[PDB]
Amino acid sequence: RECDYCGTDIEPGTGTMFVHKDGATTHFCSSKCENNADLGREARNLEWTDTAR
Template structure:
């Protein structure tokens, strides 16, 4: 089990999305909603109300 980099939920093996930046930083996302909020919109998870983290 892995943890989503944005919302902190558990991700089952074989599901989710991995995003690797040019500097080698790896982000794991459980859904496209989390991915868009972090990468495209640049939001911080502690300031988003629906995140349970």
């Protein structure tokens, strides 16, 4: 799997999947990303993110 946020390859047996209100799904590879997301930021504007890269 790939983290739906930064895009790095999520290490098997690792990561959290957040189920949205509407039913949508987002697999985060780390707390750091989940938390960048909760701030309302978009991975594309973070230079450390594989997404941005």
